[PDB]
Structure formats: structure tokens, C-alpha cells
Design an enzyme around this catalytic site. Sequence first.
Site, short mmCIF file in Angstrom:
data_model
loop_
_atom_site.label_atom_id
_atom_site.label_comp_id
_atom_site.label_asym_id
_atom_site.label_seq_id
_atom_site.Cartn_x
_atom_site.Cartn_y
_atom_site.Cartn_z
N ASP A 103 0.80 -1.23 0.00
CA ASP A 103 0.00 0.00 0.00
C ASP A 103 0.83 1.28 0.00
OD1 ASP A 103 -2.33 -1.59 0.06
OD2 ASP A 103 -2.31 -1.63 2.25
N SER A 104 2.11 1.21 -0.34
CA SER A 104 2.89 2.43 -0.43
C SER A 104 2.70 3.08 -1.80
CB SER A 104 4.36 2.16 -0.16
OG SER A 104 5.13 3.34 -0.29
#
Lengths: 477, 40, 44, 89, 49, 48, 192, 115, 240, 257, 64, 98
Positions: free
Chosen positions: A205-206
Amino acid sequence: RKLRRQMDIIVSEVSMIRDIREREIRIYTDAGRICRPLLIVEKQKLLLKKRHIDQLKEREYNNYSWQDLVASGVVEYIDTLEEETVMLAMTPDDLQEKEVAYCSTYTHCEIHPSMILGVCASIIPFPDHNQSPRNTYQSAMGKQAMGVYITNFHVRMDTLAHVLYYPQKPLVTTRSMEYLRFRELPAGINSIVAIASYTGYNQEDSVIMNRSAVDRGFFRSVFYRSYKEQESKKGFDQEEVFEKPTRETCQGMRHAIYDKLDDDGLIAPGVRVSGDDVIIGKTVTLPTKRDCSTFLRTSETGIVDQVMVTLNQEGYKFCKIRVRSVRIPQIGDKFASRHGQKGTCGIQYRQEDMPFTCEGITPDIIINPHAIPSRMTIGHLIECLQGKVSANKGEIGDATPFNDAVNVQKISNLLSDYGYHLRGNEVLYNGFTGRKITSQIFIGPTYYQRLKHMVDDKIHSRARGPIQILNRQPMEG
Amino acid sequence: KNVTLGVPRLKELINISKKPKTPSLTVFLLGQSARDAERA
Amino acid sequence: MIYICGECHTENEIKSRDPIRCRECGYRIMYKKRTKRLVVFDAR
Amino acid sequence: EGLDDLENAEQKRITTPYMTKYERARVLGTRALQIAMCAPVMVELEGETDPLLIAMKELKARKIPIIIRRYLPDGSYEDWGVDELIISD
Amino acid sequence: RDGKLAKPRQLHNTLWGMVCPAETPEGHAVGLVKNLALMAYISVGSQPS
Amino acid sequence: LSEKDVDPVRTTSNDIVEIFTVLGIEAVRKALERELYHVISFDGSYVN
Amino acid sequence: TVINNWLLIEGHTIGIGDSIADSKTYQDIQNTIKKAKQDVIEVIEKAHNNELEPTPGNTLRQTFENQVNRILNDARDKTGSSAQKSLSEYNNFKSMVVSGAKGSKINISQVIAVVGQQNVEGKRIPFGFKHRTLPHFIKDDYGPESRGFVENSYLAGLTPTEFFFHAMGGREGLIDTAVKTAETGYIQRRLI
Amino acid sequence: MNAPPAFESFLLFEGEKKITINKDTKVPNACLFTINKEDHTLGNIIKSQLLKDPQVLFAGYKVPHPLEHKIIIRVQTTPDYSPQEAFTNAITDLISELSLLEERFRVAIKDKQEG
Amino acid sequence: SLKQRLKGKEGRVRGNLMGKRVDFSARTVITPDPNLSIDQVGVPRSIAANMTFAEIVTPFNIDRLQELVRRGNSQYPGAKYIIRDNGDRIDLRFHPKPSDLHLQTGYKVERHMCDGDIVIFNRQPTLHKMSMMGHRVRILPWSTFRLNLSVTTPYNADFDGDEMNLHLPQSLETRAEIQELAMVPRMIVTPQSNRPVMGIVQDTLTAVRKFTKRDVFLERGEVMNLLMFLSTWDGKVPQP
Amino acid sequence: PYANQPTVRITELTDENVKFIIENTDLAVANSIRRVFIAEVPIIAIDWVQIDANSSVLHDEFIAHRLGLIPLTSDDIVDKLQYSRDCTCEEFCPECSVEFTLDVRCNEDQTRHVTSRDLISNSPRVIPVTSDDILIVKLRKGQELRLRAYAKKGFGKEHAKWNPTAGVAFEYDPDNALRHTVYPKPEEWPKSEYSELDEDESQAPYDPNGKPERFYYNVESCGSLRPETIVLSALSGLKKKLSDLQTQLSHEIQSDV
Amino acid sequence: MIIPVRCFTCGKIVGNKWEAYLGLLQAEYTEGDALDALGLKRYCCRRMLLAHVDLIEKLLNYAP
Amino acid sequence: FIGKIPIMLRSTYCLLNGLTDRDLCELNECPLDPGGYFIINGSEKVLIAQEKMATNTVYVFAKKDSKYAYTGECRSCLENSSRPTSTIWVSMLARGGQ
Ligand SMILES: [Mg+2]
Ligand SMILES: [Zn+2]
Ligand SMILES: [Zn+2]
Ligand SMILES: [Zn+2]
């Protein structure tokens, strides 16, 4: 029902419920009953006609409005109790069609099925194409995003306020946004998002951001923090007053410079401030006078934007100091894709480091592909696709849910006319080596939101700091 | 039919109280009832 | 020590002893005049 | 959390000759602190400055001058020299 | 006391068009906090006379 | 367990309190482990 | 470090092209769903005609629901496996599912073929309205669409009724997540 | 607060050397060239020029961390050729190619402008 | 009253004994870093300059510590305090004159945290051993903490805004104890289930599937690029 | 074993962009060239601003940001202008920077649009590219914006404001003869403007002996530098970097030997 | 608040095209035709003007 | 005079009622501001709608743990008056008693 539809003796908010199987008729006139307007259907035909629509189009300079529809008996409010007895057609185009014959006794019809959504949920594009927990998570993110909270934000002196430098209206909107005024007060920027595993810095999720875009103001925002203080003479022994402490005035003073303060004890606008600076100089007479100055936190670094002096409700001298801090996107800042894909900035790559298309277009944000399969946020992919057509076609795409006129196949057909792969893919070139990427990357304009959670607002450190004298244990200084 | 499992069953094993949520037996048969539905 | 009236935007000089009330408009909201010091902004 | 909790309404050594991971951790840490306190190093060190790395070198050489007193549950104890125990690494 | 008898956190069928199905907070408040639908209106009340 | 044609060896109960008063603390020790293992293994998880 | 640098040459993505399926696959999915509805309608007719016999240890309602649920589950499994088999080697959803990095076979089928039946407390959508799931259906409508069978995929987009039933089914996942997150720590702090 | 100065990505600090050479003890005729304040622009171009040399057995570059401004180039040559000679030769080859490229680009502009 | 100070969650035992605030700890948002080792944590320069480790002055580090003393707090890495044999603490920022700051064996210098320092990194809720692992500090020029993608598995961490707690051991005994007991490599396999607690994930897991396919071929230039990232490489290029 | 023999063929040359083709060159050289266009071509841009008065609705550092992004005429002056770090002066001076001044006061009911035309520089060589004009903040009656700024030499590697390119299109092997990219269905991909394939053809036959060559470029300029000046400044700039590295490398070798 | 000076994605100047764009819209040009007339070929540049909201026009409605 | 009642902004009794967008701008107020909140000591306070069971309506329920097999309650409240609501429960005792 006739009297209610005519508004002769019964007002529109009164609900009449007949329990046919129980010989009971309940009429509720009390307050607090939740209700919604529904179009009336008679003999499998809508009472709403083109004449009403024409009068509704000619709304201005004609005074025809919603109240004329209710008075005409075309639409009426149905509450949760009456809905039990109501046979509601989802749409007149297909539910009341004699060819379907599913039900021959429809009493009402939905105006538009998308009106079941709330304020934050109506901001989601294609919510009918997203998994239900992601629509719930976006409803929270939409409240935590950044934009322009109100037009008079310059006059207001709110304790905390984040204003985005360049908010933009979404390239792919939901019809409800016109009523939510999301066009006049947007909370985000349409970002050229590429879904690729670019060097792994976008994993888990970066997000990876284009440093050159950030240098140009992409997602740049201004943070306004307002500090309030007053001088009160409660207790004749104590008298606090605003004035800069001076060696002769105060028996004891720290080596910290108070030169930032004016003769009135208040810092002037346009002065840089930090945790070492004093914004207000206040001193209280002892039963010499002690100083009770208001210092900023070590994390607080900005410029004094505005300083007001007034008499508050208590009649005491009162002042508010608004400190302005500009928050430039940096590693760790949280972003949202408007579809529940919340993520922190992992790294920032300049325009030459980011991958580029044959046209030289570099994505503003690169997200990990693994975020989509588990979340099944297909509405995000469709929005990214619809946004690519929107930017090329020069039209704001409509992503209203439950709309049969807009589908992936029609969007893909339009995109093919603009010289792009019908599924939104593009041949990206690696910025580091210039070699074409073997896999074609899905890239397109997607509306992103910057959340109020900045890394500078959460970073903190403690090493042999101030302790409580009684408990001899750590405490904030 | 339903049976208590997962976190609430683990909770009952640590919280050994006089009244479980789904007290039950697992009965086995010796003779023909083990192989004949009618005898069972 | 100059303050700007929040209503009539007129510069007025006020001491510690006299009230915040505007000299001519009577409005009681005053804004401090921008500092005369030089503030440098890097165009980044 | 309570609603879900109630749901009411809704010579003569017997120990192993191997040095335990815990013994190694404390022995190295203790010897490193001694080395940092100018204690003489029992091994010829070359180009080493970290007292903890020096303690590891002494352990590999089995030169640490420390004895482990292993306390048994009955209150008895066994004194085992670091040079006598087998190092797990 | 009333909420202990029946769990109000679930999205009940009667919320159609009255309350947003998706818009609810995460954590201890799931389904306790709700938001009105865009066209949802609340009765103001009047005399039954 | 006292009933005829019912297996007195394999028949058991999931109520640990019943096992304690009918079979004893050692039966509980084995019964608790079997019940504890079942709840852990039900979804395929494993614990040493 | 080695593979993440090779991934710059090969690259990895996920997009609309991976959610698309061949027209033949869509026809097979539509035919399977059509067959499932007809089968459920036949089960409904048998129950209405009293031609359905309850199974041992189960009442008529339980027997009827068990038959209807297995038909809808088989339809979802058939539509899902058909979609999964039709995907190409280039399909990025398969690449992540095959590697096990993220997603699963069910996710592919829900995105591409059929989201499937929505359940509240392990049962089909309840009659929140007396004899009805929503005011749009007829009373006593035990049909798949009435009780929350979402025949559309996330690519095709859920109908208005399917969207509310998917929000009802998803609310249970949000509640159970909040519960598990709160009471899991409790069991450990007690054991210790 | 923690943001580094933008100029640090290309300016050497006091006492920082542009290039430092370390012999690779793992294989003979191998050296590690660490270049400070440089990136893929010089690392990739030099790596390719080295690979074109038949006497270069290995040529590769890496950035230890994208937040750092260093590139490490490992070069291995045949026993009769030294990596420092290959590295210097590769750089002269690039300077020659770019010099010729500049002259030809200038001529192309004149030709395009004149006709 | 006296009894009131003892009872409750905030009482002496539960609020001041069984749990309490601790010095030499920092918290900030965590971000990915595929370039750091699994046992390495990237730390902001501001956090590293704020946190300190007390190093005992020894003839092996007398010169190194004297340098850090003159650098002081203004220049990182430096030191915050000097502790003499008498146990008195001297702040270096107050008077950095070297004539008065000469060191001798037995002194303690509170130098700033630097590369290779051992720290305990934790993510709450702390549900098992692998929720608190020892890491090596790596200074990075941004306010976030950097974690290798592999260690996200035991921490159950995801870079959607999560924050983690960093603790710096204050003595060689605890520092060596962490090195020998709690470092990430020793936590790779968990005794809970006889299996590795962390594995390859996401991009590296999908790419390794593709990379290991039979029809994936790498050219000489590609292979030599990948071999630069293989720290365990013996320097010999295998026969294609 | 030695340098390539690159050749250039310019396809388009206007005041906005220059389109050209480079042949007989390595992909690394071709890529490093486009990277230099973005990050290593020096131009002059505002980097320091003193705002004496600002009654507008936009805050001081927001006005300063917009001014930094404004492109300034720097074709010939940038070559002779020194970096503030390299100049022997104490502070900003004509040898390392150009002074800019803006003083706009609104006293009319009609809104006054402050534009790049309102910026007056002390050097005629460095002036805003527009002197339509780039929009700066809009002043209501009684509002004013009075400031002075300094423009200095820098390149895109430091900040995007110093990037002279408005987009650098780069392409090679438009027919995918090298198969560096593998399309799942080549018939679905549109043909590149540089492609030489027939209507029925989808891809060129795979060339296992092929290597990247004949690089296509389209360098669009923001206006700070002429498009051809960007390429010439970049090539000479890239050569300078390599020549500087060779010099330091020689001293290192000479010190070790 | 106001039109960006540079296009975030590529750096193209768009800060001088807003009033031109509004002029084209007033001349009955469609949003797409107006973007084409201004030469905004890349969709990233079109996104700048097509999605821009010039709130400064409303902020100027408040007294200084 | 008996006191002061806090006024909801933009209500029929608010000063910003019926004012045109230009008048709101002249008053330094946002024309788009929806209102519907109270300013208390300068802080904008919003009243969250409280959900509760409907009054004056018979509801029949069953409690497994209670002694009552079934119970019919009615939360009686007088017409727009006598705010204190009195609840009557008509409960049927269980058959299972020994
Ligand atoms: Mg997280
Ligand atoms: Zn006044
Ligand atoms: Zn100068
Ligand atoms: Zn652009």
C-alpha cells in the site's frame, strides 16, 4: 392519499399505513420520522410527464420548483413504515414494463437509485464496481482528505485547517457532486497514476511520487494553526497582561530571545516562528511579575499569518495568532485514491527517474499492483480508464452508479479513438535505463486525495526528557 | 445446525464455566447400529 | 504600534492603556500590521 | 468489551554441557562491559575497537574468564567454566 | 439498555434510501453512527387535529 | 456411556466440566487438548 | 534486491484488460446463471406444490434453503472456474494469484464472473420488510435476486438491489473485523 | 525538518572525493569504483561503454540507496588489462562520441535552418 | 486519599509499575525500503540526533569520542553530554571549548545514535516475540522509519499509515542481549508453528514466480546488473 | 571496443520543440542524453524572493512558489552566469544572479491581473518568456503585491523549476522488432507515428541479432531555452560531467600508483 | 485557488492559457476544441485546464 | 426579558436568512456554507440527530433470559407536551414454571 397528494388537509410528511392483513390503519403525524420522496406510479404509468420536466427545465424566471411537483401529486414522501405497503419500481424504463410482467401493481418509482448514497459515498465513482468494505473506508477517507473546507478560510481563524494549493474538480464525477458542491470546493487533484511495481518502493500500500511534480506544487498545501490567548484579572492578587518581558521587569528570564514580540507583547505577522520562538508575551503579577509566555512546539515551524486583538464574550482582552506552515508532499504523507486505497508516500523520484511513455508523460503517482486484486476496487480501474478518455475527449466523465449508459466496453471503444490501448495500457520506458518495460503499464488520470495525516505531525522522539517531579517518570516537555 | 467454534470456543476453553454455549456429545455405536441406519 | 480595523481597514495607533475600539468605526477587531522586517522566501 | 464477555443481553554435574542462548547473551554482554571498562583482554585482538566484538572473539577462543553458576530448582548449583561449555554458535 | 436486546450495528433492509449503506465509521462505532441519504428527509411534525 | 449398544470407549462430550466429573482430570487433560486442537485446526492453522 | 531490480525490466501491473474476459466466457457465465435461476425456480415450485420432502433432521424451510443455497454456490463455483480457466497467461490477476502474493481464486471470479450470494449471519438476506427484502420485490419472493444473489461481477457493476445486499453482507465483515480486533488481545492477556 | 538540501544530490561536501577505487579481493583484475554525487546518468552510460570493450569480463553498476547519492561500478578485466585502464578508456570513448554528436547536431541545425 | 492513589488503572501498581513511559524511544510513520536488510531500520536524522547512547571512554575509542565531543549537538553525529568519573553530567552545547572537554578513560560520552546502533523496534499490538525485534540503525534523510518488506510479515505491518515504536538499549549488557536474542535473523523461524514467520511477499513474490519461469532468459548486460545486487555472489559469472 | 559513430537527422525544428533521430548509438547513451535534458541543462529561474507587501488572497510563500515556476529568457546569459556557490562574491550580484522587481497596486473596481509582464528585471537578457502572460495573483481594489526577487543559475536536478523541458518524448524500435515489450494481443495496440508497418501488420518480425538503435526524440521547451539550445547545452553538459570525472579519476589513479 | 503555472506531469506552461481557455469557451468552443486550439496535446496538460477550479475569482468577492 | 436562545445559522431567525450571495460575501460569510450549526463561545457546534424507539406505539418482544415469555411495551408520551415518557410493559409469564 388523495388529500395528501393535493395537500388540502394532510401535509406531505404525514404517512398513512394500512395493515390489510390486520385491519389496521396507522396515521403518523409526529416528528422525527425519516422519509424520502418517491414518484407516484398509476396504472403502470408514471404521473410525471414531459410537461413537468419542461417546467422544471425552465426553473429560473418561472418560479416552478419541487413544491409544484408535490402539489401536482406527481411525487410524494414515503416513510420507512409506509414503504412496507409500497410496491416500488426501481426504474420506469424496465421495472414497470408490461414485457417483464414481474409485478402489475407498482405504486411508486425511485427517482434515481443512486440517491440511497450519503454525502461521502456519493463522491465515490462507480461504487457499484467496488467491494462494499472499500466504499465504507472511502467514506472515512473523504472526511480526512484535504481541499478547501470553506471559501472564507482566509477570514476564519480555525485551530486547525489544511488548504490545498491547487484543488481540482474530478475528471470523473458522480452526478450527485453537483449538489454536494464538490465542483466549487474540491478536495483533491487528478493525478496521472501508473499501476506498476516500480523498484518496490510502492509495496504494501505504499505510493511513489514524482518529485518534479511536487516541486511544481502537486498536492502542495498550507496548514493554518490558530493560537488563542486572553488576559484575565480574576483574583485581585493576580493581573496578567500582554507585554514583552524585560530583564528589569521580570526577576528571572531565560536566554531565549523575545525580540520577536512587539511592545504589546504580541508577535507581528510575517515573522518566522519555531519552537524556540515566543508568539505571545504574557506576565502575571505575583502576590516583580512572573512570565507566562506561550511558546510553540518544537515541531511547529512557520510564519505568523494573522494576529487579531478583540474583547471576547467575557470582555477581557483576547487575541488569536494564526501560524502558517506550508506542507510540501514528502515521504510518509498519506494519500487516498477516492476508492479506499489509502497509502503513504514511500519515495519521490524526479521526472528523469520516473518511467515515461512514448509521449514523455511520467506518472505523478505509482501504486503497487497487488493493492487492487485483494481489494477488488475495479471502480478505481474504471475511473482511471474513464479519466483517460475524459482528459482526451475534453469532457467530465459521468461515473454515477447504476447507470447503464456507461460501461467498460463503451469507455474502451472511445479510448481506442484517441490512439491509446483500449484497456488503458501503455508502453512505459524505464527512467533509469531507457529500456522498454516488458509488461505494459496501466496508466491514466485518477483523482487522488491528500489526507491530513502528515509525517511531520506524527514524528516524535524522546531521550532523557522532562520528568514529573512527584512521580519521577517521563512526561511531555 | 450450528456449533460454537473459533474465538468464542477458545474463550470457553480458557473460561471453563458451568454452562457452555453449545454443550454436546459425540456418541459412537458398537454393533449393527454402527453399520445399519435403522439400528442406529 | 499600528493596528488595522477589521471593518474599515484603517490604520490606527493604540497604546497598552487605551481600548481596542476603533478610533472612528468603533469596531473592536484589530489586526496587527505586517512586520517591517525582511522575510526571505526561496521559490521552491 | 464487557457485553461480549458476559453476553447477558443483546564434579557431579547434571545440567547439559551446552551453553544456552541466554548464557551466551549475558556472558558476552557482561564481558563486553568489562572490556569497555579497561579490563584486560584474554585474546590477542588486532584492529578491533568494539568491546562487544572483542567479547565475541574471546568466546570463540574460549578465553572468557567467567564461570556460570547454574541454579537448580532444589537450590543446588553447578559452576561451569565458559571454557568447559560447548558453544552453540 | 435498549440496544442490548438487539444489535443495531447491522445494515437493516429498512435503511434503503433512508440512510447511506456504505458511510459508517470503523472500530467500536461500526453501524452505530449513520448518515442520511441525499434525498432523505426527516418529518418535522404537526398537530393531528 | 451406560447405555447398551453405545460405545463406552469412544463416546465423549465437548463439555469439559462433564469430562471432569465423569472421567477425571486426566481425561480433561486429553479432552482439553483435543478440543483446543480442533478449534485451532478447524481453519487449517497449526500450533506446535 | 536482485528480483526487484529485474522487475524493472519485466514490470508488473494490473488493469481493466485483466478483468476482461472473452465473449465466449461471458456467454458461458450468463448461460450458467440462467440455468441456476431456472433450477432455483423449480425448487421454489416444488416447495409451493408440496412436492419437496424435508431432509432427515431438517425442516422444510431448512431443506428448501439448503437446496437453494447449494444451487447458487454451485453456480458461483461453475462461473468462477470457467472464468479462471479462460484467463490468459498474460493476465496479471492470475500472475498474483498463482504466485500467492495477493488475491485469490474467488477474487478473480468475483471481479470477472460472479460476485455470488450475500449472507447475513450465515443465512440469505433476511426479510427486513415483512415478507420482503426491499420494497422493490413481491412478498414471499424466495428467488435468488430477491434474497441477495448478486449475479453481476464487479466489472459488470452491481444493480441497485445487489449493491444494498452487498453492503449488508459487507457490514457483517466490518463488524466481525472490529469484534476480532478487540477480543483477540483479551484471550492472550488472560492466557499469559 | 529531515528533508536534505536539494543541492546535496550533486554537490560534494567538504572532504568528499568524487571517485574512490577499491580492489575487489574476491576476483583478480576486479575493482569497485564508488562515485559520489552521481546517479544512473553516469552509471548506466559508463556501464554500457565498458560492456562494449572485449577485454572487460564484467561491468555493472548499482545505487546503494536511492536516497543516497553514490554509484558503485564493478569492473573486471582480463589478466592483461587493468580495470582502471578500461574505466578511463570507456570515459574517453564517451567523451569522443558526445563530441562527435555535438558537432553533428550543430551541423544538422544549420542544415535544417538553411534548408 | 491514600488508598485512592493505589486503586485503579492509573494507580501506582497498574499505572506506574506494571506499565510506564520509557526514555530513549521514538515513534513515527513507517515506510518501505527494499534496499535495507531485514535486520536494518532506517531512522530519521532528527530522531538519531535527538536520541543518545552512552559510550564508555576507552583507549580504543578515546580519539573517536573526543572528536564527537567537539562536534557537539550542532553537528551530527556528535554528543549531548559527558559523564566524568565523579558521575557529574556536562552538557556539550553549553561550553564546547576543547580545553575543558578533554576526555579520559572511564568517562561516559552520550553520543548521538549512529549507523549500526542496536535498537528494539516494535509495532502494537505486541501479540508475540516477533512483534519486538532487534534492528541495526541506518540514517536516512527523511522523517519516516524504513522497514524491509520481509519483516512486515511478523510485525503484521502495512504501509497505509502505521506507526512503530523504536527503543534504544542504553548499555552493552542489554545491547548484547538484543544482538544475541532478539535480532530479526534469529526470529525468522517461529516456534509457534515450526515454520518461518516471515517470507517473500508482494512484488518480490509475484516477480519470483515470473522470474523462475522456464522461458525467462537474461542477457549478459541484464545478468551483470542483477549480480551487482547479490551481496553473497562469489564474483564468478556462471556459464550461461 | 571504442566509441560509437552517432548520426543526427532533425525531423522538426520550431521555436517550441525540436524533433530529431539519433542512429548508431547505445540505449544507455541515448537514455542518459534525455535524462540530461530534464535534470542537467542549466537555466535561470527565480530562487529567492523578498515580499515587502502582499494584500492578495494568496500567502507570501505561495506567491514565491508561482514566481519560481515562471520561465525566464536565458539562452545566452546562462552560459556566462555563475552559480552563487561558485561565484567569488559575497551575496547576490550581477555576476551570479539577476534582480527582479514587481510592484502592483490595484485602485480600480476592475480586478487587476498581475502577470509575468509586471515583473521588471535589471538585466534585459533575463526576462519572462511571455514578455499570453503567465497568470500571477489577482488583486482586488485596494490590494497590492510588492516584492523583489533574484533569479539564479540552476538545473532540474535541484528543482523542477530549473527544468527547461515541457516534455521529452523518447522512443526506439517503434515496430517492436527487438520484442523488448511483449503485447498480449499486438492487434490491439495502435501504431507509433514512427512505425514502418503496413495496415495488416501488427509487429515487425523478431530480430534476435538486433539491438536498440535509431532513437527518436521530441524535445519541447518551456521557452527558457530554444529547443535546439537544450540539446546542445545537454550534450556539452554531459561531456563536461564525464570530462570532470575523468580528471578526478586520473588523480585518484595517480595517487594510488 | 488559481491556475497552476506549470503542468504537474510535464512542466508545460498552462498558467498563461486559463484566460485564453475561458475566452474560447465563451466563443462557443467545446472544452475539447478549446484545449486543442491552445495546443494542449498531452492529456496531462488537458487535465490541468479541464479540471481546474479558479476559486480566486470567488475569494476576490471578500473585502481586503 | 427571560434569556437568550442560541440561534442555528441560516435559520429563519438567523441574520444570514434570505440574504443574497453578495450580502453573505459582504458579511465575510461563505455563500456555500450550509449552516445548520450553532456558534457557542465561537465554536461551531452541530447537534447530532439521536435515534430512539418510536413513542405511543405497541411493540411485542420476547426475552429468552427473562421470566416473561412475551412482553408488549408502549412508550407513551403526551402530544407535544409532558416530555417525561412513561413506559407500560404488558408481560406474559412463562409456561415452564414448575
Ligand atoms: Mg499500516
Ligand atoms: Zn474601524
Ligand atoms: Zn553575487
Ligand atoms: Zn503536461
